[PDB]
Point group: C3
Chain length 492, copies 3
């Protein structure tokens, strides 16, 4: 009789982690750090709503396609939401030069303010009310973009146009003008009368003439002609002058860039519900508490970092279930490691929070420190490209997948590598706890091989805990012990 | 007399791995996972042959340079093979607009079918048989591209051309046309007679006029004039119309994109031998059994992942060579760890496949699991760029080297890091095996310090293996043992 | 009496490293490998000075803006130094086509030699001395770019120009020409008299007409007109021909690319001091002895690798402070591990350089081997982009930050991971050293639990070191020992 056993915690936990060498091992304490859920809505970002283009495209909005809403309030936005194939773009066919680059400039701007530079009624020298077309219905009557004017000959004449705008604001200004390409030569004179025309624009930074390419093309929303648009940022103090003898499509309104910052053009077929998140994906929002998610690679806001995994669980606790050789003590709470009182007066299971506090520490200090090392992890950024930019487009994707594949690898093999060390730690602690016991009770005790000690003396409860504190003095029971040792020697 | 010794395997192996801390350490069992060989041929990919352009370039092929083969069979291809500096490109000098982007579109397409849109004999209004040139010999007589027609004035007139093609197929169609730039004004009238000409093309997505730039340049394959080509993809249901009053170079044949998928334009001076691989490099094929190779960074097919190393060896077995303290037991087969019978009846070397099966397991389960984590590793993709695209070209290469340098680093430091843990495992197993022995034979045995036990009792062969199974009961020999212990005490 | 104790080194060191699990742990021996200092000057690279543009831009230099220095010596350069917003660029306003790509070509070229192709006095057919302007003062009188000529009508006529240059040199040649865009039609005739003009250039590789876009723009350094420049590399054996009837701005001097290699255009507001480094950043030079620095991401030369850290310390030695259980022996020099002579004749502290030499080895062999694995680490490369290239610009930066964030992560978690293994090694060594002692002195000694042994016999100094060498024979003192053991048994 009279013993002591060194064991470890074990409990109702059934969550199970993986490591490099073994897989799905059951553990007691562990933390999942993958987010895999989303609410499937489109929401404001930390209070500020997205600009939702609805069925319109960025171009249809900026030009004022009769079908597209204007934002008369001049709001700021957390991000912009375009559908994947918007219905309302260039109602009048044509192309929009360096369009993809303009959108990119949107991504770093948060608030426009539409302002009027060339009032539609100030074109005393031409017809400003004819330039409309069936290709651009509004309320089922022919019409036209609202923010640029399709100036037409007046009383069979088209006086060469020179008009300037001196940008006297603090902000940069986005301005869009355009030029008309007719079907045939008859139509050219029919609208503008000068056989040969041009549209030239001048700033400090930007010199460009433009001339109408007359060619027969197929009908598109009613129209074999096309109209080509251009744009520039006119810096504060600079001015812009338009020269034309025809085909000029004049800006009425400019766009004041009043707040630049972080935004994006998110492509999603969702529409806004009354809902605010920290982190938004084109398929829903994200409850950004975990450090990792696998929901979508284009997320914006205060987001966890995206990895291509289906599982990511940190191990922090123990493996699940007399003597540590034979498994764990379900009968332990109030600690991770410890002992067992089998005494003249005893009954077991007091912990060694000496070493459990020192281990609950460096475990939670290691897992924090793990989230933190991917602070700088690759987040992906939206960009678009045209049908003659395929090479670059694929470049970009290889870059974004390239970094995701990398960080996903980092993410995994960090978890499993430290998982193995977390568990190698417990095995170490247990056998260490053992030793501080063994190396103080030395001649007075039997190494029962299970991981327990039988006493050649009597310990008692105050000397019992005197093994916890490393207190035990070999001498105070030395001579008592040496007697019974040499009885079992030559006894029984 | 009467003993037992705990030892580990050791054998004729001489393959040697590295780790972080020590280098070239000799081991017993290990697996090389670098491929470094190649057969130096160009082969089909899993049954399907490459399109081999021979001395021709992608342009010379697509336009039908008289020197280039046509593919009348309409085959599909695993990949396309261009030489590095092909001899047959634009036989007639000029430039090929957005050529580099066209090639990129090749890389994602597997099978053309040439079809005739504008039959050469249907140009009743012009001379279709004169447009040939010494710059384009076929059989040593002047000639010209085969898939586009160099329409010339007929009987000193050049009626303005309008011709359309409505694309009624399911597939996209690649079409190439072109415009002629003459030496001087005399030549312009000499061939097309209208002093001022244009070439305009119209689709839904594409509006472009083109006008001849008349300038004296140096002779190139006979010709100071140049000819500029263009191309577009005409989508199903769309149509295309060409307008010209001169210099038009008309398509005869279009190209039906009938199979898109994974392919590439591989630059190699090899030519095809009768040979099929899974993985092909521009210097030869690859016996894709290893997870890594260092042969070439542009490989295509079911390929191992390329790393810039010269060695990559996993350690899975032991280090090479009474008692484990002093090295390994060459005299062990049928296991990795185990013992030795030195008995009244004994002779040594029965294994502990208890722990060897449990370790041959997690070793082969770890090495599989290592190949798998680079499942998502960066493979590089061919792209070309023109002399005004250098920035992007270098961008791309920095990206591709950037990811290769990364994954090569991952690859190495995965091997060495787990190599060190594989070997730390064996040391652990050996000393653990020891303990399950020691902790059952306790008072009845002498800890000879070599890693062996001498018996204060007698064991015998059935109790012998009774240490393997953890079977041994201390009591059944306890009193027998305690006698001889206290004889060596106060004996001899 | 009569004992022996196994302990480890401990000393005045106070440098402290981190690992994954614990942080700032004090150690004895360690090596910092982060560089964080710089001298704040601009210096030659290994003997060869930078080309310092001063207040001029690459364009103002190459064109010979009257304000910019010429380099009459034809020097080679280690790298080029542009200020961030240079004062002297196009003194005459306009734009410089594919400028950003030209600069990139600078980065891979080390030495020009200006040579004269079209001598300014050889324009017998036009006015070569009028083409000057207030926009380009030199000594406060109107003037003009020095390396191109603003040819003007002579005696009210402008004979169509045809001039050629056959490039008969071995080197490539950079040539720049230009075309003038006037305010209005009156000015066009005023200078060149032909109402309609062109500027066409012909090489093997390059065919381009150019025509003056006449439009009113705002005054810039005096001038509402603009002038547009172009450039090409004319390969050896090729020729170039310029055709014009007006607005031609003719090259006088070409640039011989005579040494290509590694250089760069470094943007810095510093100016050169008399100073040479191996590694230069736009904020100063770098004492490139460490493997890592955090000074600046664009460094050039024989540079350490840049990481975004503030600390990077390798641990190689021990943790700081009878028996190893209780800390380290300040009283040890001449080794890392070892013992202590407490003997009939003894006094302690002789080392076990058996195992210290074997550990000082694999520690310095591991730290070298760590610097080496980032041999291939991502270094960043300068590139510039125009206001319509934003997408690509941001692509590039995401790429360069993307790889830096990665390698910074690698760098850190390599240090901390091996730091933990370096320290796990010492704990291992110490307890191992212990064992080679314990397993030879076995029955003759008391395992005092502190990590020391008391002798049931007497050892003496020659048997003392006989524990170092593993020499000790159990038998020579066995019978002497067994006597006193069985006295403490049944004694006192």
């Amino acid at each position: 009789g009279d013993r002591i056993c060194i064991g470890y915690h074990a409990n109702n936990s059934t969550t199970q982690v993986d490591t490099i060498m073994e897989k799905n091992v059951t553990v007691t304490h562990a933390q999942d750090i993958l987010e895999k859920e989303h609410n499937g809505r489109l929401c404001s970002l930390k209070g500020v709503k997205p600009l939702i283009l609805k069925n319109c495209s960025v171009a249809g909005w900026l030009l004022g396609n009769p079908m597209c809403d204007e934002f008369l309030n001049a709001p700021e936005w957390s991000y912009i939401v375009e559908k994947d194939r918007p219905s309302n773009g260039l109602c009048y066919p044509g192309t929009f030069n360096y369009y993809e680059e303009l959108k990119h400039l949107m991504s770093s701007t948060n608030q426009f303010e539409k302002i009027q530079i060339f009032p539609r009624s100030s074109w005393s020298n031409h017809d400003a009310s004819s330039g409309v077309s069936s290709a651009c219905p509004y309320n089922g009557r022919s019409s036209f973009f609202r923010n640029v004017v399709w100036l037409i000959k007046k009383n069979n004449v088209y006086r060469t146009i020179t008009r300037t705008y001196n940008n006297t604001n603090i902000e940069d200004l986005l301005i869009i003008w355009g030029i008309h390409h007719p079907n045939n030569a008859a139509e050219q004179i029919k609208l503008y009368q000068n056989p040969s025309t041009y549209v030239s624009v001048g700033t400090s930074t930007l010199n460009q003439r433009s001339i109408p390419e007359i060619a027969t093309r197929p009908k598109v929303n009613g129209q074999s002609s096309r109209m080509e648009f251009f744009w520039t940022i006119l810096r504060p103090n600079d001015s812009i002058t338009f020269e034309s003898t025809g085909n000029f499509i004049a800006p009425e309104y400019a766009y004041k860039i009043v707040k630049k910052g972080d935004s994006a053009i998110m492509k999603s077929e969702l529409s806004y519900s009354n809902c605010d998140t920290k982190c938004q994906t084109p398929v829903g929002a994200i409850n950004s508490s975990m450090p990792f998610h696998n929901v979508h690679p284009f997320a914006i806001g205060e987001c966890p970092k995206y990895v291509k995994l289906k599982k990511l669980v940190l191990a922090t606790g123990l493996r699940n279930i007399a003597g540590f050789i034979e498994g764990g003590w379900q009968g332990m709470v109030d600690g991770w490691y410890g002992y067992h009182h089998s005494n003249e007066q005893g009954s077991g299971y007091a912990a060694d929070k000496e070493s459990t506090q020192k281990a609950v520490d460096g475990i939670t200090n290691k897992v924090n420190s793990i989230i933190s090392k991917m602070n700088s992890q690759f987040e992906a950024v939206g960009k678009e490209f045209n049908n003659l930019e395929r090479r670059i487009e694929n470049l970009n994707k290889k870059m974004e997948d390239g970094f995701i594949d990398v960080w996903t690898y980092n993410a995994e093999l960090l978890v499993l590598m430290e998982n193995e060390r977390t568990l190698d730690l417990h095995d170490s602690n247990v056998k260490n706890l053992y030793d501080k016991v063994r190396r103080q009770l030395r001649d007075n005790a039997k190494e029962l091989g299970n991981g327990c000690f039988e006493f050649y003396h009597r310990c008692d409860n105050k000397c019992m805990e005197s093994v916890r504190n490393g207190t035990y003095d070999y001498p105070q029971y030395s001579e008592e012990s040496r007697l019974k040792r040499e009885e079992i020697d030559s006894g029984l």
